[PDB]
Amino acid sequence: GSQILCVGLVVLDVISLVDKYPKEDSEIRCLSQRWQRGGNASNSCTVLSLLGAPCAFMGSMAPGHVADFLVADFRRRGVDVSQVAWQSKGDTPSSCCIINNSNGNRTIVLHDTSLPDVSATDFEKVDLTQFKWIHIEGRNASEQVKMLQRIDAHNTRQPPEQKIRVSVEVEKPREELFQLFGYGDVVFVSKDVAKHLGFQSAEEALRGLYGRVRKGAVLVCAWAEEGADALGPDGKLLHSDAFPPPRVVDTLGAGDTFNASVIFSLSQGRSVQEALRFGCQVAGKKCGLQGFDGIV
Amino acid sequence: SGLVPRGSQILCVGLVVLDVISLVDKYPKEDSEIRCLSQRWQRGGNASNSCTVLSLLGAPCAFMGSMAPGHVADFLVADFRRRGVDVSQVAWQSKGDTPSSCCIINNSNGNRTIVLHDTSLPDVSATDFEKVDLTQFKWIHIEGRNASEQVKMLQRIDAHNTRQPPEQKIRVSVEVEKPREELFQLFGYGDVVFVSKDVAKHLGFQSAEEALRGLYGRVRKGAVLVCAWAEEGADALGPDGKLLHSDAFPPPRVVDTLGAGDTFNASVIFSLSQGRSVQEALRFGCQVAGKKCGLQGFDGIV
Ligand SMILES: CS(=O)(=O)c1cccc2[nH]c3c(c12)CCCc1ccc(CN2CC[C@](O)(c4ccccc4)C2)cc1-3
Ligand SMILES: CS(=O)(=O)c1cccc2[nH]c3c(c12)CCCc1ccc(CN2CC[C@](O)(c4ccccc4)C2)cc1-3
């Protein structure tokens, strides 16, 4: 029970840093370029390792030079990759990421290689005794629900002191992912999902969506410059103001930095109020830096 | 790198870039996440593209350009090798990024949005060019970029040629593709000068004929000035003052014109290096470039 596992995607992010976002049909020169190991679950793993937590990543990877870069990067961070589901395909997903240096805005053109996701059968082969926390990035909901049901069955057999804590993220407004609300101790809901469901604030979203979570769960919603809110079984709304940097330069993976920081703080025995603030603190510091170097 | 026989290769000096092309349903709004329909990694750059065409035409060829060690350079090297291009003359850098460009293509319009590569990578210097043994090249083509440094490279080829008998003299070509003032000094260099339609239009010329008559005064004695003008074909003008022309060879269906100008340049160079006349080289240039326009990439231009 020493590691934090993040189940989700690993994506190669091909980053172009620009002065201003290009208008359609225009030619602009970027300030700089870099390759970054991306994907929500993989970004959270980077932040967790930088925070000093032993962590493991589970995702599908195809053998090749792109995977070689990602594995070397994962290992340079100390991310445990022994759970990677290697695929027979041969195509790793990549993204063209446009980062506006004037305000930190990040535009992603994702190339989904349609490679097979992590299955419940792949998850069934994993020894769970080594993990204290399991975080799942919403993707293939039907398969993920089974992975979540396996963790539940494991936890029924364990005393309260050795129970694996669970978190889920619902970041895309896809109807099939809304079944994931009923799973996990901690549920992260994005501003984009909340807005798509008609909610105009983190407070509106939490009060309107709490009925979907399982008994005793905490629902969390970050709302960019408005900070973040959380709602638990006591019905008390919790809030943290954001910690914006004086100059916002890169917000790519800020949501993932918030998620990992909230997870880390909660796994350390801190209260929901303290975890919300810490989430905003680390994510806010990240927004004033290119990439993840310098958060610690 | 193996024994290269004397005066056998065609060298192209210029840019190599990794083009990341993303085909999208709708142009993304700022700070949004969208899925592309299809995405492709392609080796680009004028000199780099001409090398591909030269290899496919059956000419031994080499590329000279700047690269920085890394995964981008690894992909670009593997692509050059896939096209049978000799990369032994690449100037490896200790500072900068290997050029990478991001093109967004809208499926619902056909519009192209380009986020061009940064300029952190140093160009090939006259000092880097001075270390190259020239005896293995029969032809040297220079893509105009850092003109003041390239003028010195051109002066080194001239000095080499003064001691050579007419059969062992290295033939020279230059391309002026961007309407940048500093590049215009390159007109006075080379046996063959390629001028783009874009440059000609920016200088106020409305046709290949107008451009050739108006710019011939800038080339060195005995040089041939060449200007391709898309569907209007291509023209050439030499010291005899006779305007030469070839009609275009458009394909039944146009698929892709990216690198068509580079296909024309390499084909003209190849034909001339084979002892053919300027008239025949113009026609061959239009023939191969026209065939390319009906194909995706360079496979099948044969
Ligand atoms: C976990 S978290 O830390 O809550 C967080 C998570 C994910 C994404 C996030 N974005 C932002 C934060 C944030 C919070 C702190 C940093 C910040 C500062 C300013 C703005 C708002 N800016 C961003 C360009 C902006 O939209 C703009 C538009 C037009 C002109 C100038 C700026 C107006 C957002 C964030
Ligand atoms: C050496 S050369 O062979 O003279 C040559 C050199 C450089 C560039 C060149 N372009 C074209 C030629 C050409 C020659 C004939 C073929 C052709 C047909 C149609 C159009 C017109 N354009 C306008 C959008 C276009 O119709 C398109 C459609 C679909 C995909 C991409 C472009 C295509 C140009 C050329």
Tell me which residue range forms the domain holding B155: 7-302
Phi, psi of B231 (to 5 degrees): -65, -15
> Under 8 Å CB-to-CB from B46, ≥6 apart: which residues?
B14, B15, B143, B175, B177, B261, B262, B265
Out of B22, B32, B106, the one facing A96 most closely (by C-beta) is B22
Question: Most A CBs within 10 Å: which of B23, B31, B103, as the mutation test of the A interface?
Answer: B31
Which amino acid type is present at position A249? V
User: Are B116 and A26 an interchain contact pair (Cβ–Cβ within 8 Å)?
Assistant: no
Buried b (16+ CB within 10 A) or exposed e, B177-195: beeeeebbbbbebbbbbbb
Domain count, chain A: 1
Contact in structure between A105 and A99 (CB atoms under 8 Å) = yes
Residue B234 CA to ligand 2 center (angstroms) comes to: 12
Q: How far is residue A248's CA from residue A122's CA, in Å, rounded to a whole number?
A: 40
Q: How far is residue A221's CA from residue A274's CA, in Å, rounded to a whole number?
A: 15
Contact in structure between B17 and B44 (CB atoms under 8 Å) = yes
User: Are B113 and A22 an interchain contact pair (Cβ–Cβ within 8 Å)?
Assistant: yes
Q: Tell me A105's DSSP state.
A: -
| B159 is known to lie in a ligand binding site | no
Q: Tell me A87's DSSP state.
A: -
Report, in this order, helix, strand and coil percent for chain A, each rounded to 5: 35, 25, 40
> Residue whose CA is closest, atom 25 of ligand 1?
A103
Rg of chain B on CA atoms, in Å = 19
Q: How far is residue A251's CA from residue A195's CA, in Å, rounded to a whole number?
A: 19
Which CATH number does the domain housing residue B100 bear? 3.40.1190.20
Contact in structure between B62 and B8 (CB atoms under 8 Å) = no
Q: What's CA B68's distance to the chain center, in Å? A: 21
Backbone breaks in chain B after residues (C–N over 2.5 Å): none
Residue A278 CA to ligand 2 center (angstroms) comes to: 57
End-to-end, the C-alpha distance of chain B in Å comes to 26
**Assigned domain for B188 exists:** yes
**Assigned domain for B189 exists:** yes
Q: What is the largest CA-CA distance in chain A?
A: 61
Which amino acid type is present at position A69? F
Residue A249 CA to ligand 1 center (angstroms) comes to: 10
> Under 8 Å CB-to-CB from B86, ≥6 apart: which residues?
B1, B4, B9, B60, B61, B62, B63
**Assigned domain for B2 exists:** no
Q: How far is residue B43's CA from residue B16's CA, in Å, rounded to a whole number?
A: 7
Q: How far is residue B278's CA from residue B256's CA, in Å, rounded to a whole number?
A: 27
Closest to B71 in 3D by CA, of B42, B98, B46? B98
Question: Most A CBs within 10 Å: which of B42, B111, B113, B198, as the mutation test of the A interface?
Answer: B113
User: Are B39 and A108 an interchain contact pair (Cβ–Cβ within 8 Å)?
Assistant: no
Q: How many Cβ atoms are within 10 Å of B82's Cβ, its own excluded?
A: 11
**3-state SS, residue A236:** coil
**Interface membership of A112 toward B (CB under 8 Å):** yes
Antiparallel, parallel or unpaired: β A131-137 and A3-7: parallel
The experimental resolution of this structure, in angstroms, equals 2.1
Closest to B132 in 3D by CA, of B9, B232, B27, B260? B9
Closest to B220 in 3D by CA, of B187, B173, B174, B242? B187
**Assigned domain for B146 exists:** yes
User: Are A26 and B114 an interchain contact pair (Cβ–Cβ within 8 Å)?
Assistant: yes
Contact in structure between B298 and B259 (CB atoms under 8 Å) = yes
> Residue whose CA is closest, atom 19 of ligand 1?
A225
**Assigned domain for B227 exists:** yes
